[PDB]
Design a protein around this ligand. Structure first.
Ligand code: B3N
Ligand code: CO
Ligand code: K
Ligand code: K
Length: 356
């Protein structure tokens, strides 16, 4: 049947509050609306995550803390300050991801979308990198009720450390993250020699990338890795994290990608035809993130979209040119193709240890 699109007016208003990405949620949805793609999807009201559902991953001590400070010392510092209503926004986004997982279980759909999810840094007892709750972990754990092996792919600019760590000692969930890996660059983990630990050894994969990667070399990397993971690990479902802080024009100022490069990655995964749970993440050039996740939504739906941005609530944000396409910046590509090749070999090596 048709892709699920998780959405409600109130969920969006809630996610709009998030101080680092104000009104992003409305922008993304408004743009998806303007292209009529919600017509071609099933809309499902997210449920709010209960206290017990969040404790499938997070500790009770953490969670009760989060709640208390939401009314008026678990990582709630500079990057995750303890503002009002944060407990509720966290529950909302957690429930939204879980809800999508549920839809995939009940075979309602083969793809389910929560663009406002993708909070990949949160730990069981600590906030991190703007992430107060790990919704990707919550959804993976929900998918494990039905699906034997889960692949978590993370294409955010940043290492999916929170999700990797949660599953670091298990062979039931494999984590693949492609990310900027550089001294000083958050969160600092996920060098190619990071493979997980114990029973989980070889069931974490990390691709370290330098500034200025563009669509071609990026897709070459991504395809090469996923092909191997697919053959070795033979996943029964995919949780996919598509943070748009990789996209040219983002103030993270790092990668030099366009949504076409990412959708080719998404297409690769989609052809496996598994239960796939699609998440957003970072993305701080707000119009650009909307263009990306709108385009990606086109891809999910095998639609080609018109190059001119329809008029809608946030049309002014798309000036001066009002086109869907993003132009690569002229920034240097810092990725030596030798280093990339050793990275790919090192991973191919690693993945030989994975036999199901
Ligand atoms: C005062 N000073 C010199 C500094 C203050 C903050 C940062 C920083 O960490 N910036 C990066 C914030 C991390 C965001 C990661 C969240 C994300 O998009 N994950 O996907 C650096 C220097
Ligand atoms: Co990010
Ligand atoms: K990543
Ligand atoms: K693992």
């Amino acid at each position: 049947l048709v892709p699920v699109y998780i959405y409600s007016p109130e969920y969006v208003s809630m996610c709009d509050s998030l101080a680092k990405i104000p009104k992003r949620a409305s922008m993304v949805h408004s743009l998806i609306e303007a292209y009529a793609l919600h017509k071609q999807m099933r809309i499902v009201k997210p449920k709010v995550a209960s206290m017990e559902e969040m404790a499938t991953f997070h500790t009770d001590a953490y969670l009760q803390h989060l709640q208390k400070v939401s009314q008026e010392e678990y990582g709630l510092g500079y990057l995750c300050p303890a503002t009002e209503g944060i407990f509720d926004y966290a529950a909302a986004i957690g429930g939204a991801t879980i809800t999508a997982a549920q839809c995939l279980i009940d075979g309602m759909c083969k793809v389910a979308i929560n663009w406002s999810g993708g909070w990949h840094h949160a730990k069981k007892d600590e906030a991190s990198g703007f992430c107060y709750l790990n919704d990707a972990v919550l959804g993976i754990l929900r998918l494990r009720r039905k699906f034997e092996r889960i692949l978590y792919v993370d294409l955010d600019l940043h290492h999916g450390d929170g999700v990797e760590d949660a599953f670091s000692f298990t062979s039931k969930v494999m984590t693949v993250s492609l990310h900027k890996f550089s001294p000083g660059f958050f969160p600092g983990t996920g060098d190619v020699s990071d493979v997980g630990l114990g029973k989980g050894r070889y069931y974490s994969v990390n691709v370290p990338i330098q500034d200025g990667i563009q669509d071609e070399k990026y897709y070459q990397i991504c395809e090469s890795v996923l092909k191997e993971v697919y053959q070795a690990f033979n996943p029964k479902a995919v949780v996919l994290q598509l943070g748009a802080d990789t996209i040219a024009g983002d103030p993270m100022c790092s990668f030099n990608m366009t949504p076409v490069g990412i959708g080719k990655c998404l297409k690769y995964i989609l052809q496996w035809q598994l239960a796939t749970l699609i998440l957003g993440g970072g993305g701080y050039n707000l119009a650009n993130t909307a263009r990306c996740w709108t385009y990606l939504t086109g891809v999910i739906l095998g639609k080609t979209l018109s190059s001119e941005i329809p008029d809608h609530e946030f049309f002014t944000a798309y000036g001066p040119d009002y086109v869907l396409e993003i132009t690569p910046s002229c920034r240097p590509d810092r990725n030596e193709p030798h280093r990339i090749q050793q990275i790919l070999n090192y991973i191919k090596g690693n993945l030989k240890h994975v036999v199901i």
